[PDB]
Amino acid sequence: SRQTEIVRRMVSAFNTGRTDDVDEYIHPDYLNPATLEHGIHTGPKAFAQLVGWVRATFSEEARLEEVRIEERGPWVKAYLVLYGRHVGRLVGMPPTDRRFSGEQVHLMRIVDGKIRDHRDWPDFQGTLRQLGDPWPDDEGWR
Amino acid sequence: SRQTEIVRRMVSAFNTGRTDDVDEYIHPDYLNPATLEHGIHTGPKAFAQLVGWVRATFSEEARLEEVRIEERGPWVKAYLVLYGRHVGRLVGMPPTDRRFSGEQVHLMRIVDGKIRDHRDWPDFQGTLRQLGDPWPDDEGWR
Amino acid sequence: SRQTEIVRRMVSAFNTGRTDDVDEYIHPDYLNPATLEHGIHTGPKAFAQLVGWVRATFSEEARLEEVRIEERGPWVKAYLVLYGRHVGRLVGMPPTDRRFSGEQVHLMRIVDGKIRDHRDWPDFQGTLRQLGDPWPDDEGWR
Amino acid sequence: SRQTEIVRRMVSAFNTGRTDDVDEYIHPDYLNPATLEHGIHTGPKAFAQLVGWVRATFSEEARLEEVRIEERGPWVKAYLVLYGRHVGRLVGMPPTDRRFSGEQVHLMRIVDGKIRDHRDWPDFQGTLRQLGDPWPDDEGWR
Ligand SMILES: COC(=O)C1=C(C)CC(=O)c2c1cc1c(c2O)C(=O)c2c(O)cccc2C1=O
Ligand SMILES: COC(=O)C1=C(C)CC(=O)c2c1cc1c(c2O)C(=O)c2c(O)cccc2C1=O
Ligand SMILES: COC(=O)C1=C(C)CC(=O)c2c1cc1c(c2O)C(=O)c2c(O)cccc2C1=O
Ligand SMILES: COC(=O)C1=C(C)CC(=O)c2c1cc1c(c2O)C(=O)c2c(O)cccc2C1=O
C-alpha cells in the first residue's frame, strides 16, 4: 500500500499542477524516457517539468482518473484514464482545441521510497482519432 | 449536409433526453438490432426508449461528442465519443458508479428524410476496463 | 477449472468448425442476443449456426487465441483475440478480403454443465478500421 | 505517390529485415525519438538498428500490414497493423512467447526524397494485454 500511495501522489500532481514537494516522492535519478525530446532530463525537476508540459498541452482542466493500481515487488502499474483538451502544440501539431479521453498505463519502479523509473503508455491512436487526425505543420517537431 | 444534420439531431437527443419530436426524424420502421433484448422494438417510440435507456444507464450527465460525421449515399457514419457514469444496471451488472469514456461508431440509413436503420458499435471492452471489469450478479441479464 | 474447460471447448469450435458435439456443452436454452438478426435463435443448433457464420464471414483460417479466462461463480469471462479475413458479407458490407485482428471479450453463464447465456464484445471499431472503413451497399443489412 | 512508395519501402524493411539499401531512402539526419533509450541514434544506421530490434523483439515472423497511407505536404501517415510474437526482452520484461497483433500509426517527414523525421505510435496497451500483462524483472529496463 505504501507504493500505491506514492503513485497516487504522482497522479495527484498531474491533476493539481502542484510541484513544490516533488523532491519528497521523485528519486534524484528519476527518468522517463519519453521526456527527453522536450529537453526534460532527470530527477524531481524533470518530473515537475513533465507535469507542467501535460497541463500546458492538455489544459488546466486535464484529469487523470484512477481505474486501478497494481504492484509486484518494487514495480507499480497504474491503469488511468486521461481527460483533456488539446490546447498546446503536440509533436508539431497546432492545438485543435478538441476534447478527448484515453486510457493510459504507467509503469514505475520505486527505489528507496521514491519514483525512479517511469514509463507511460498513452492511447496515442485513440487521442489522435478524437483530435480529428491532426497533422504537423511545416515547422514540425524538430 | 441534410443527412449530417439529421444525425446531429439524433446525437442531440442523447445529450438532452428530448424525445417529444422523434417522429420528425425517426422512420416509422426504425430498428436498432441491439435494442431487442431490452424489449425495445421499432419506430420513433423505440428510439425514444433507447434515449431513455442510455441516460438511465450512463446518467443524465452522459455526453456524446462528435468527432466527425461522414456520408455515402443514404448512409451516414458518426464517429462519436461517449462520456458517462455507470449508474444503471448493465447486462446484469450492478452500477459501479464509475466514470468512463469511449469512442463509438454509429451507422445509419436515411430513408425519406428519417433514420430507419441504425447500428451502433460502442467501445465495450474499453468501457468494461474503465468500470473495473465488472461481473453480472446471480440475477444476470436474462 | 471445469468451467474454464467448457469455454475452451467453445473457443475450439470456432477454430475447427466442429459442431457435431455441441449438445454436450451448449445448454438447450442457449442464447446469444447478437445472433437474432441473422435468424439464429436458441440452443445447440443456434450455437452451431453461429460457428458457421463466423467461419463464413471471417474465413476458414479464422483463429481465436486465448489470452486469459476468468471465472466467478457460474460466470466465465474469456479474453481472446480474433484473427481473420473479411471474406463474407458483414452488416450489409461486401467482403473487403482484408486481414484483421482484434481483441474480444466473451461472457458466459454455465448452467448445469453447459453454456446457457453468452454475450460477446468484438473490437468492432478496430476491425472496421483495419477493413478500411467499409460501407454497406444499397442492399444494406435489412 | 512518390512519398507513399518511400514509406512502403520502410514498411517492407520491417517485413524482410533487409537493411543493405537503407541509405537510399533514410535521410542522413534520420531520428526516431523512441530509439534513443536503446542506444540507437541517427541516420540510416539508426534505422537499420531499429529494424533489427523489431525483429529481435517481435520475431522474424513479424508482419507489418498496410491499412492505408495518407500524405499532406512532406508528411506521410501510415496506418499499419503489427503481427508478432514476444520473443525478445521488452522494456525489462522477459519474453512471454505470446502472439499479438496491434494497430500502429507512423508519422514521417520526407526531406529531399528520404525519411528524416519518424514517430511511431504502437498500440502498447493492447499489446500488453495480449501478452498477459507482463512485468519487468528485478533487472528492469535501465
Ligand atoms: C498524463 O501524462 C501523459 O499523458 C503523458 C506523459 C506523462 C508524458 C508524455 O511524454 C506524453 C504524455 C501524453 C502524450 C504524449 C506524451 O509524450 C504524446 O506524445 C502524445 C502524442 O504524441 C500524440 C497524442 C497524444 C499524446 C499524449 O497523450
Ligand atoms: C449512446 O448510446 C450507446 O452507447 C448505446 C446504444 C445507443 C444502444 C445500446 O444498445 C448500447 C449502447 C451502449 C452500450 C451498450 C448498449 O447495448 C452495452 O450493451 C454495453 C455493454 O454491454 C457493456 C459496456 C458498455 C456498453 C455500452 O456502452
Ligand atoms: C468469434 O466470434 C465473433 O467474433 C462474433 C460472434 C461470436 C457473434 C457475432 O454476432 C459477431 C461476432 C463478430 C463480429 C460481429 C458479430 O455480430 C459483427 O457484427 C461485426 C461487425 O458488425 C463489424 C465488424 C466486426 C464484427 C465482428 O467481428
Ligand atoms: C514496427 O515497429 C514498432 O512497432 C516499434 C518501433 C518501430 C520502434 C519502437 O521503439 C517500438 C516499436 C514497438 C513497440 C515499442 C517500441 O519502443 C515498445 O516500446 C513497446 C512496449 O514498450 C510495450 C509493448 C509494445 C511495444 C511496441 O510494440
mmCIF file of N, CA, C and O in Angstrom, chain A residues 52-108:
data_model
loop_
_atom_site.group_PDB
_atom_site.id
_atom_site.type_symbol
_atom_site.label_atom_id
_atom_site.label_comp_id
_atom_site.label_asym_id
_atom_site.label_seq_id
_atom_site.Cartn_x
_atom_site.Cartn_y
_atom_site.Cartn_z
ATOM 1 N N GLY A 52 4.077 20.198 -15.778
ATOM 2 C CA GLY A 52 3.841 21.455 -16.480
ATOM 3 C C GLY A 52 3.470 21.257 -17.936
ATOM 4 O O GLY A 52 2.521 21.891 -18.450
ATOM 5 N N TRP A 53 4.236 20.371 -18.593
ATOM 6 C CA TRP A 53 4.003 20.103 -20.015
ATOM 7 C C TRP A 53 2.631 19.469 -20.232
ATOM 8 O O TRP A 53 1.883 19.828 -21.164
ATOM 9 N N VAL A 54 2.272 18.514 -19.380
ATOM 10 C CA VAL A 54 0.964 17.877 -19.548
ATOM 11 C C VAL A 54 -0.127 18.923 -19.438
ATOM 12 O O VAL A 54 -1.087 18.975 -20.225
ATOM 13 N N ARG A 55 -0.056 19.797 -18.461
ATOM 14 C CA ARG A 55 -1.119 20.779 -18.275
ATOM 15 C C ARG A 55 -1.144 21.863 -19.342
ATOM 16 O O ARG A 55 -2.208 22.376 -19.728
ATOM 17 N N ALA A 56 0.030 22.213 -19.858
ATOM 18 C CA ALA A 56 0.149 23.156 -20.944
ATOM 19 C C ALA A 56 -0.391 22.589 -22.244
ATOM 20 O O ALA A 56 -0.876 23.346 -23.085
ATOM 21 N N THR A 57 -0.302 21.278 -22.420
ATOM 22 C CA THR A 57 -0.670 20.652 -23.672
ATOM 23 C C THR A 57 -2.137 20.219 -23.681
ATOM 24 O O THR A 57 -2.838 20.364 -24.685
ATOM 25 N N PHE A 58 -2.585 19.680 -22.556
ATOM 26 C CA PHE A 58 -3.910 19.066 -22.460
ATOM 27 C C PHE A 58 -4.831 19.840 -21.515
ATOM 28 O O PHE A 58 -5.926 19.349 -21.232
ATOM 29 N N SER A 59 -4.399 21.008 -21.064
ATOM 30 C CA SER A 59 -5.126 22.057 -20.388
ATOM 31 C C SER A 59 -5.156 21.901 -18.861
ATOM 32 O O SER A 59 -4.942 20.789 -18.360
ATOM 33 N N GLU A 60 -5.439 23.017 -18.194
ATOM 34 C CA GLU A 60 -5.518 23.070 -16.757
ATOM 35 C C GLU A 60 -6.735 22.349 -16.249
ATOM 36 O O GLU A 60 -6.966 22.132 -15.089
ATOM 37 N N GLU A 61 -7.651 21.945 -17.081
ATOM 38 C CA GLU A 61 -8.730 21.039 -16.754
ATOM 39 C C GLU A 61 -8.439 19.570 -17.019
ATOM 40 O O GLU A 61 -9.301 18.706 -16.862
ATOM 41 N N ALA A 62 -7.230 19.217 -17.408
ATOM 42 C CA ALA A 62 -6.919 17.802 -17.565
ATOM 43 C C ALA A 62 -7.138 17.055 -16.250
ATOM 44 O O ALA A 62 -6.928 17.612 -15.164
ATOM 45 N N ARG A 63 -7.629 15.850 -16.405
ATOM 46 C CA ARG A 63 -7.962 14.985 -15.284
ATOM 47 C C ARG A 63 -7.424 13.599 -15.577
ATOM 48 O O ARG A 63 -7.692 13.071 -16.620
ATOM 49 N N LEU A 64 -6.677 13.062 -14.619
ATOM 50 C CA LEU A 64 -6.236 11.691 -14.696
ATOM 51 C C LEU A 64 -6.997 10.882 -13.643
ATOM 52 O O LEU A 64 -6.797 11.118 -12.464
ATOM 53 N N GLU A 65 -7.850 10.012 -14.076
ATOM 54 C CA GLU A 65 -8.683 9.232 -13.154
ATOM 55 C C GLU A 65 -8.059 7.862 -13.015
ATOM 56 O O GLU A 65 -7.520 7.324 -13.931
ATOM 57 N N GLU A 66 -8.188 7.320 -11.832
ATOM 58 C CA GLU A 66 -7.639 6.016 -11.482
ATOM 59 C C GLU A 66 -8.638 4.902 -11.761
ATOM 60 O O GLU A 66 -9.756 4.998 -11.257
ATOM 61 N N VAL A 67 -8.273 3.937 -12.553
ATOM 62 C CA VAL A 67 -9.065 2.708 -12.677
ATOM 63 C C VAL A 67 -8.605 1.696 -11.627
ATOM 64 O O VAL A 67 -9.390 1.173 -10.832
ATOM 65 N N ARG A 68 -7.296 1.422 -11.640
ATOM 66 C CA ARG A 68 -6.717 0.511 -10.678
ATOM 67 C C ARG A 68 -5.197 0.634 -10.670
ATOM 68 O O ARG A 68 -4.598 1.033 -11.647
ATOM 69 N N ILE A 69 -4.643 0.306 -9.518
ATOM 70 C CA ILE A 69 -3.193 0.316 -9.342
ATOM 71 C C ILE A 69 -2.787 -1.047 -8.807
ATOM 72 O O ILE A 69 -3.381 -1.527 -7.832
ATOM 73 N N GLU A 70 -1.821 -1.650 -9.472
ATOM 74 C CA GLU A 70 -1.252 -2.950 -9.137
ATOM 75 C C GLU A 70 0.217 -2.817 -8.733
ATOM 76 O O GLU A 70 0.868 -1.871 -9.180
ATOM 77 N N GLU A 71 0.718 -3.753 -7.908
ATOM 78 C CA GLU A 71 2.148 -3.740 -7.641
ATOM 79 C C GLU A 71 2.717 -5.150 -7.641
ATOM 80 O O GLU A 71 2.017 -6.145 -7.427
ATOM 81 N N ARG A 72 3.987 -5.266 -7.878
ATOM 82 C CA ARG A 72 4.730 -6.502 -7.832
ATOM 83 C C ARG A 72 6.163 -6.110 -7.476
ATOM 84 O O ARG A 72 6.862 -5.477 -8.244
ATOM 85 N N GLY A 73 6.600 -6.498 -6.283
ATOM 86 C CA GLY A 73 7.942 -6.100 -5.917
ATOM 87 C C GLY A 73 8.033 -4.596 -5.866
ATOM 88 O O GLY A 73 7.164 -3.918 -5.336
ATOM 89 N N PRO A 74 9.069 -4.058 -6.443
ATOM 90 C CA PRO A 74 9.215 -2.613 -6.469
ATOM 91 C C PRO A 74 8.524 -1.895 -7.613
ATOM 92 O O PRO A 74 8.675 -0.672 -7.783
ATOM 93 N N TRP A 75 7.801 -2.680 -8.390
ATOM 94 C CA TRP A 75 7.112 -2.146 -9.535
ATOM 95 C C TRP A 75 5.645 -1.851 -9.232
ATOM 96 O O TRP A 75 4.969 -2.650 -8.606
ATOM 97 N N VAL A 76 5.174 -0.729 -9.766
ATOM 98 C CA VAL A 76 3.765 -0.352 -9.678
ATOM 99 C C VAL A 76 3.233 -0.060 -11.082
ATOM 100 O O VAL A 76 3.910 0.582 -11.864
ATOM 101 N N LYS A 77 2.036 -0.555 -11.371
ATOM 102 C CA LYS A 77 1.385 -0.365 -12.636
ATOM 103 C C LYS A 77 0.093 0.409 -12.374
ATOM 104 O O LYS A 77 -0.696 -0.072 -11.570
ATOM 105 N N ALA A 78 -0.055 1.542 -13.008
ATOM 106 C CA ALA A 78 -1.260 2.339 -12.853
ATOM 107 C C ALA A 78 -2.074 2.349 -14.131
ATOM 108 O O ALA A 78 -1.582 2.737 -15.189
ATOM 109 N N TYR A 79 -3.306 1.919 -14.025
ATOM 110 C CA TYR A 79 -4.298 1.953 -15.087
ATOM 111 C C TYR A 79 -5.128 3.200 -14.839
ATOM 112 O O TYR A 79 -5.887 3.262 -13.882
ATOM 113 N N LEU A 80 -5.002 4.193 -15.711
ATOM 114 C CA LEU A 80 -5.608 5.503 -15.579
ATOM 115 C C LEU A 80 -6.432 5.825 -16.806
ATOM 116 O O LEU A 80 -6.317 5.116 -17.813
ATOM 117 N N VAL A 81 -7.165 6.914 -16.746
ATOM 118 C CA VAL A 81 -7.801 7.487 -17.946
ATOM 119 C C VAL A 81 -7.527 8.982 -17.921
ATOM 120 O O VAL A 81 -7.806 9.626 -16.880
ATOM 121 N N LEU A 82 -6.995 9.522 -19.003
ATOM 122 C CA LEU A 82 -6.795 10.956 -19.152
ATOM 123 C C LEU A 82 -7.962 11.582 -19.847
ATOM 124 O O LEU A 82 -8.424 11.069 -20.885
ATOM 125 N N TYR A 83 -8.453 12.659 -19.285
ATOM 126 C CA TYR A 83 -9.444 13.519 -19.876
ATOM 127 C C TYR A 83 -8.778 14.873 -20.098
ATOM 128 O O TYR A 83 -8.237 15.440 -19.158
ATOM 129 N N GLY A 84 -8.785 15.347 -21.328
ATOM 130 C CA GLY A 84 -8.140 16.614 -21.582
ATOM 131 C C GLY A 84 -8.726 17.361 -22.765
ATOM 132 O O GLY A 84 -9.729 16.962 -23.318
ATOM 133 N N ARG A 85 -8.039 18.438 -23.109
ATOM 134 C CA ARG A 85 -8.399 19.269 -24.257
ATOM 135 C C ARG A 85 -7.097 19.694 -24.896
ATOM 136 O O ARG A 85 -6.180 20.155 -24.225
ATOM 137 N N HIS A 86 -7.030 19.521 -26.227
ATOM 138 C CA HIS A 86 -5.781 19.807 -26.931
ATOM 139 C C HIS A 86 -5.586 21.315 -27.134
ATOM 140 O O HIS A 86 -6.110 21.856 -28.118
ATOM 141 N N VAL A 87 -4.910 21.940 -26.165
ATOM 142 C CA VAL A 87 -4.727 23.389 -26.129
ATOM 143 C C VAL A 87 -3.284 23.816 -26.316
ATOM 144 O O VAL A 87 -2.998 25.011 -26.482
ATOM 145 N N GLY A 88 -2.319 22.898 -26.377
ATOM 146 C CA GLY A 88 -0.944 23.185 -26.676
ATOM 147 C C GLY A 88 -0.404 22.384 -27.844
ATOM 148 O O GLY A 88 -0.906 21.309 -28.148
ATOM 149 N N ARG A 89 0.625 22.922 -28.494
ATOM 150 C CA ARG A 89 1.285 22.229 -29.618
ATOM 151 C C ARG A 89 1.751 20.843 -29.168
ATOM 152 O O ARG A 89 2.293 20.645 -28.049
ATOM 153 N N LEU A 90 1.531 19.846 -30.008
ATOM 154 C CA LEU A 90 1.793 18.443 -29.653
ATOM 155 C C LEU A 90 2.486 17.823 -30.850
ATOM 156 O O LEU A 90 1.830 17.760 -31.928
ATOM 157 N N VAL A 91 3.721 17.347 -30.673
ATOM 158 C CA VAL A 91 4.509 16.741 -31.753
ATOM 159 C C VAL A 91 4.333 17.495 -33.065
ATOM 160 O O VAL A 91 4.071 16.931 -34.116
ATOM 161 N N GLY A 92 4.465 18.840 -32.994
ATOM 162 C CA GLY A 92 4.459 19.655 -34.194
ATOM 163 C C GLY A 92 3.076 20.016 -34.709
ATOM 164 O O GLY A 92 2.959 20.695 -35.739
ATOM 165 N N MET A 93 2.048 19.568 -34.019
ATOM 166 C CA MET A 93 0.654 19.777 -34.395
ATOM 167 C C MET A 93 0.035 20.930 -33.632
ATOM 168 O O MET A 93 0.003 20.852 -32.378
ATOM 169 N N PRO A 94 -0.408 21.973 -34.321
ATOM 170 C CA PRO A 94 -1.043 23.056 -33.556
ATOM 171 C C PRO A 94 -2.259 22.588 -32.788
ATOM 172 O O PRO A 94 -2.875 21.633 -33.186
ATOM 173 N N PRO A 95 -2.621 23.293 -31.710
ATOM 174 C CA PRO A 95 -3.785 22.872 -30.915
ATOM 175 C C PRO A 95 -5.110 22.851 -31.647
ATOM 176 O O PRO A 95 -5.586 23.811 -32.236
ATOM 177 N N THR A 96 -5.811 21.726 -31.636
ATOM 178 C CA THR A 96 -7.104 21.564 -32.260
ATOM 179 C C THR A 96 -8.245 22.105 -31.399
ATOM 180 O O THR A 96 -9.338 22.277 -31.945
ATOM 181 N N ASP A 97 -8.031 22.316 -30.134
ATOM 182 C CA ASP A 97 -8.996 22.727 -29.115
ATOM 183 C C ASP A 97 -10.079 21.698 -28.856
ATOM 184 O O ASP A 97 -11.124 21.886 -28.247
ATOM 185 N N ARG A 98 -9.883 20.472 -29.270
ATOM 186 C CA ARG A 98 -10.756 19.330 -29.167
ATOM 187 C C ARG A 98 -10.533 18.647 -27.810
ATOM 188 O O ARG A 98 -9.416 18.466 -27.314
ATOM 189 N N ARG A 99 -11.679 18.284 -27.237
ATOM 190 C CA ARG A 99 -11.697 17.437 -26.059
ATOM 191 C C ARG A 99 -11.395 15.993 -26.463
ATOM 192 O O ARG A 99 -11.692 15.536 -27.568
ATOM 193 N N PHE A 100 -10.789 15.260 -25.511
ATOM 194 C CA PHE A 100 -10.500 13.842 -25.722
ATOM 195 C C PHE A 100 -10.423 13.131 -24.406
ATOM 196 O O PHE A 100 -10.238 13.747 -23.352
ATOM 197 N N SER A 101 -10.502 11.825 -24.496
ATOM 198 C CA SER A 101 -10.230 10.982 -23.346
ATOM 199 C C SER A 101 -9.531 9.730 -23.780
ATOM 200 O O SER A 101 -9.892 9.213 -24.836
ATOM 201 N N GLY A 102 -8.592 9.201 -23.037
ATOM 202 C CA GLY A 102 -7.974 7.935 -23.405
ATOM 203 C C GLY A 102 -7.358 7.239 -22.201
ATOM 204 O O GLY A 102 -6.787 7.872 -21.324
ATOM 205 N N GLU A 103 -7.506 5.925 -22.183
ATOM 206 C CA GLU A 103 -6.852 5.136 -21.179
ATOM 207 C C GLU A 103 -5.342 5.310 -21.286
ATOM 208 O O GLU A 103 -4.812 5.557 -22.396
ATOM 209 N N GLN A 104 -4.654 5.159 -20.158
ATOM 210 C CA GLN A 104 -3.200 5.159 -20.130
ATOM 211 C C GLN A 104 -2.709 4.178 -19.073
ATOM 212 O O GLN A 104 -3.382 3.998 -18.059
ATOM 213 N N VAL A 105 -1.538 3.611 -19.363
ATOM 214 C CA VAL A 105 -0.892 2.706 -18.413
ATOM 215 C C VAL A 105 0.464 3.295 -18.090
ATOM 216 O O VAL A 105 1.192 3.625 -19.005
ATOM 217 N N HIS A 106 0.753 3.393 -16.798
ATOM 218 C CA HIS A 106 2.041 3.803 -16.335
ATOM 219 C C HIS A 106 2.714 2.661 -15.562
ATOM 220 O O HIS A 106 2.010 1.963 -14.810
ATOM 221 N N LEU A 107 4.011 2.554 -15.760
ATOM 222 C CA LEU A 107 4.822 1.570 -15.048
ATOM 223 C C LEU A 107 5.957 2.282 -14.357
ATOM 224 O O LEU A 107 6.733 2.996 -14.986
ATOM 225 N N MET A 108 6.068 2.096 -13.031
ATOM 226 C CA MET A 108 7.027 2.820 -12.245
ATOM 227 C C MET A 108 7.806 1.855 -11.322
ATOM 228 O O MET A 108 7.245 0.949 -10.761
#
